[PDB]
From TrEMBL, chain A:
It catalyses: prephenate + NAD(+) = 3-(4-hydroxyphenyl)pyruvate + CO2 + NADH. Pathway: Amino-acid biosynthesis; L-tyrosine biosynthesis; (4-hydroxyphenyl)pyruvate from prephenate (NAD(+) route): step 1/1. Ca(2+) binds at E326. This is Prephenate dehydrogenase. The keyword Amino-acid biosynthesis applies. PANTHER family: PREPHENATE DEHYDROGENASE, PREPHENATE DEHYDROGENASE [NADP(+)]. One of its GO terms (molecular function) is metal ion binding. The keyword Nucleotide-binding applies. Belongs to the prephenate/arogenate dehydrogenase family. NAD(+) binds at L19, I20, D40, S76, E80, S104, S132, G136. The gene is tyrA. Residues 10-298 form the Prephenate/arogenate dehydrogenase domain. It comes from Bacillus anthracis (anthrax bacterium). Residues 303-373 form the ACT domain.
Amino acid sequence: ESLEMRQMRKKVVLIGTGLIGGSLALAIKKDHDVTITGYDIFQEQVERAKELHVVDEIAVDLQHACEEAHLIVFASPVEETKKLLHKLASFHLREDVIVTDVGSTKGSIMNEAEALFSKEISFIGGHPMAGSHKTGVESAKAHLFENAFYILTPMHHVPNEHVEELKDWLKGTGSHFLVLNTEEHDYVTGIVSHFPHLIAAGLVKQVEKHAGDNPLIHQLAAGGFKDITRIASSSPKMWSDIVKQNREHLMVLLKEWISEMEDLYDTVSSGDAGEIQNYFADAKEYRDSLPVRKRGAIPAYHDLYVDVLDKVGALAHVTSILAREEISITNLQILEAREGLLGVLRISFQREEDRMKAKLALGEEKYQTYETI
Amino acid sequence: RKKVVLIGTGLIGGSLALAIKKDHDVTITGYDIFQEQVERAKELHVVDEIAVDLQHACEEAHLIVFASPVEETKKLLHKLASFHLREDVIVTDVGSTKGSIMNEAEALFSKEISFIGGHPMAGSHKTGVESAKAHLFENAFYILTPMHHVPNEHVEELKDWLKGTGSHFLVLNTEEHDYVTGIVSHFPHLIAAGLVKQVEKHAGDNPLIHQLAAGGFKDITRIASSSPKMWSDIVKQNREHLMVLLKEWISEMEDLYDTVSSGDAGEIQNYFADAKEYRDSLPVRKRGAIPAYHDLYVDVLDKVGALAHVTSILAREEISITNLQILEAREGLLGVLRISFQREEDRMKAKLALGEEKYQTYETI
Ligand SMILES: N[C@@H](Cc1ccc(O)cc1)C(=O)O
Ligand SMILES: N[C@@H](Cc1ccc(O)cc1)C(=O)O
């Protein structure tokens, strides 16, 4: 009754069948013929996942499904993930299995996995930099992580071939994979993600302190301030765990920050407009530079600068030209470079051939283009 | 026709001139430091005449509007105080701080002349008069700070002059204005720049910091792209308010350092919840002290022509885009393409047009 090919295809287990996990399942299915068996704490999400062909089967027996699996994917909250990794370490898994997770911090998970498997099993921590942690499987899409950074943190022993193999499993995501060591990941994300969270909340809180003394503050904090502070509305539970899990990195950062504010306090209070202006100019120069896609980093960036006018259809025209030439654009931005209605449009391409081609096509249409600034 | 003088014919000033003209039949004579901006303003019917003689134009004027940098404004106010102006004149400025300008005006005029400091809380991606528009300040707060003696009738008169802006006018005292804007606008600009600077410090030690720069970090620091010149003046002019704020902030960070280092997840959670609760309570889709981004996030697939399709749709609806980006670091942000608009009406319109073409879109809550 069942087809020999269906019986015999590879098998995946997904633990946590929500937005993130469901999306990963769709990206897997897109490029691999597999039986995905799914598991959730909430039985409605797995059943819906099944209905939506996000998973193939609902897991009766967790152990049976795991022991026959070529790939096991955790998309659960990090407490639950620890508890289930323990269970997994009790099981008799296949020799060739790959196990992976999703989480914003890596230190504690990886510390647990070295402690339970050592060198038996190929556990590779993961962090896809896209989407949301609580939202449903109805929203899951194969392209959710497309062109997003997806960090992989392999155990110390895992061969490079297994890391490449996992990249192949997730090929369908279209993510830019970076392989980092665990400390590297928590350090970087600490500076670049977690610490801003703290500062965002702080800003909001500072403003609320004063809002009782004039109600106008609540009115004037609409629009820009509210937009700036967006991340402060994220889950307090999730973020308190992140902060607890990356505590030491953040303590150090806060100490440097206090120090920076003390120097800023000296600059502001000295009242030297030249020094103040310098402080702002340094920040502007750097902030204007982002993305600063470096030469030997992943992925490569080949930029072209175009003189375009601030009018309806300017971008439509430029992008239609490029599309007609069958050139794919990796990024674009408007940089406001001087006065007047002109702006500079920066277009990024995947490789040098494509930039060259775009330069010619735009030139034949009487666009002025540049290589720098 | 009544006669208006505009001193500073750029985005802000030019826009004010257009809003005046919209509801009043007047001769607007313009003046600038840069002769090109005033000549362009004339070409564009933003001003009617280019001022030959500054004093002549000021002495016949019913309304005088300064839209210049606050240093130049002090210098020109001094000149004005030397002139023989009309009995009924109204004089007003545009400036992000009020303390120093008002202080100077009480010192030069005292109770003779009706000076009313002004602050329109709106801005733009551009700087020149070519970008000026009558509706620039529509539904924006526009603060008025009248001298101590100015009768309420003259404040109402000025509101009538500027009816065309569509702004919501608030009459504040000068200290109140600098205190509030200090908390709500200036101080965040300082913190934004500080964050950028903190991050750059570390970027030499790992280049991944440049690459992996998160969405949240980018968002809170977007304002760090504003004019360093303008902001350094603002900071110098509101120095004492900011020194106090920075001191409180240092203290807050020290308490946060205790909370984080104590490791109590309940207390940490409370800190975040307090911030969320408050932030969630702030008005939805209104204008405040920091110009908004008016961003729209769009779900698109990476294939040739994806951007072309989206921008064509928007252009056909005659919506002008201020910016756009493909986000590679977008945790918590559904939708890969971020489009920025000039104002809320345009974002709304773009959302409908894209929706009708079966694009999924998102907006931040
Ligand atoms: N407004 C243009 C894009 C643009 C924006 C700002 C500029 O400075 C230049 C061009 C469009 O809709 O296509
Ligand atoms: N490559 C698309 C734009 C795009 C880029 C990255 C994406 O993830 C999605 C869409 C174009 O050339 O129009």
